[PDB]
Amino acid sequence: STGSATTTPIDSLDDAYITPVQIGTPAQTLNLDFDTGSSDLWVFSSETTASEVDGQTIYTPSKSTTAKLLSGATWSISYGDGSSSSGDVYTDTVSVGGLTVTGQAVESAKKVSSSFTEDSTIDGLLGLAFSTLNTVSPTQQKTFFDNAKASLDSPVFTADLGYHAPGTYNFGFIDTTAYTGSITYTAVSTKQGFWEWTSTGYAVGSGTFKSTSIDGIADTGTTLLYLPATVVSAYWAQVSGAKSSSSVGGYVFPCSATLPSFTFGVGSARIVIPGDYIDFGPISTGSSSCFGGIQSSAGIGINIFGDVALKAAFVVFNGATTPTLGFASK
Ligand SMILES: c1ncc2c(n1)NCC2
């Protein structure tokens, strides 16, 4: 089997991407944030505290003839931005782009933090990291990809995120029309539960490539590119007036700037992030200070190749017995 679904930016800045997902019988379609950095599929639901729902589409398990309470199971998750959610668990039929999994754990939120309530465009998360990170207790649950993989034509999914435009998540096949050149594959460590790999270096604008190993994760659920402070300083030093602002919480730059590109290495190959992809707009409405899309990972404990990086590439998440990642230009 295969599946193919369009993923759409939630706003004009590509702050996140939503992909429609069919849950239950009859189908209830919710727009979920596909997140290769976490491993829980959770949804706003009829169980979510009413004051914490503001415009999201909810899953109502009592209206699904295939929903079953997973007795005793609870979940609770927190993300790197301080947001969180928790609840109980159903199993139900879940389909993405024509690919159907029966018995998928659908984690129903009883509580969500304020940033979730405040974002009416995201109805939940669909985790695509390794199932060892799944938070369901006392019986850990498998991700949608893990449940689907035996049925897929090939045990892979691909992320093709757009810049200010829709893109595609494919399951079970590699669309050879969706990228240019060849796909360069690179080793993955699953020891932390992530699609963790080692970039071979970087360049800023037209500058010379610096060969240096950068361990990080391919994370579609993180908006920005978080890299070591040395690398980020080298990038922003090429932007007149850019500075790190403690009050804002990262590097900012004059909105009048033209940003340089940023290149990262995948083996001997190179992925170029155009400068415009690094502009996250005014820090507050009407400001001429703009927020940078490349930020330091120094406070995080891991480097994160988030959407800013991944949207410059066609990315293969290869879930073969030994997982690997593939990157192609597009
Ligand atoms: C990283 N990964 C997932 C999410 C996040 N940050 N904020 C809300 C959901």
The upper half-sphere exposure of residue 9, i.e. CA atoms within 13 Å in the direction of its Cβ, equals 15
Ranges for all domains in the chain classified under CATH 2.40.70.10: 5-174, 175-330
Name the resolution in angstroms: 1.2
Active-site annotation holds for 14: no
- Answer yes or no: are the C-beta atoms of 327 and 30 closer than 8 Å: no
- The three-state DSSP-derived secondary structure of the chain is CCEEEEEEECCCCCCCEEEEEEECCCCEEEEEEEECCCCCEEECECCCCHHHCCCCCCECHHHCCCCEEEEEEEEEEECCCCCEEEEEEEEEEEEECCEEEEEEEEEEEEEECHHHHCCCCCCEEEECCCHHHCCCECCCCCCHHHHHHHHCCCCEEEEECCCCCCEEEEECCCCCCCCCCCCEEEECECCCCCCEEEEEEEEECCCCCEEEEEEEEECCCCCCEEECHHHHHHHHCCCCCCEEECCCCEEEEECCCCCCCEEEEECCEEEEECHHHHEEEECCCCCCEEEECEEECCCCCCEEECHHHHCCCEEEEECCCCCEEEEECC
Is CATH 3.40.50.300 correct for 175-330? no
Active-site annotation holds for 35: yes
* Active-site residue identified among 35, 123, 146, 279: 35
Pocket of ligand 1 (CB under 6 A): 35, 37-38, 79-81, 83, 125, 221-222
Minimal CA–CA distance to 16: which of 116, 131, 111, 129? 116
Residue 31 alpha carbon to ligand 1 centre in Å: 15
The residue nearest atom 2 of ligand 1, judged by CA position, is 221
In ligand 1, which atom is closest to the CA atom of 33? Answer: 9
Residue 37 alpha carbon to ligand 1 centre in Å: 8
Q: How far apart are CA 107 and CA 95, in angstroms?
A: 15
Give the fold, CATH level 3, of 5-174. Cathepsin D, subunit A; domain 1 (2.40.70)
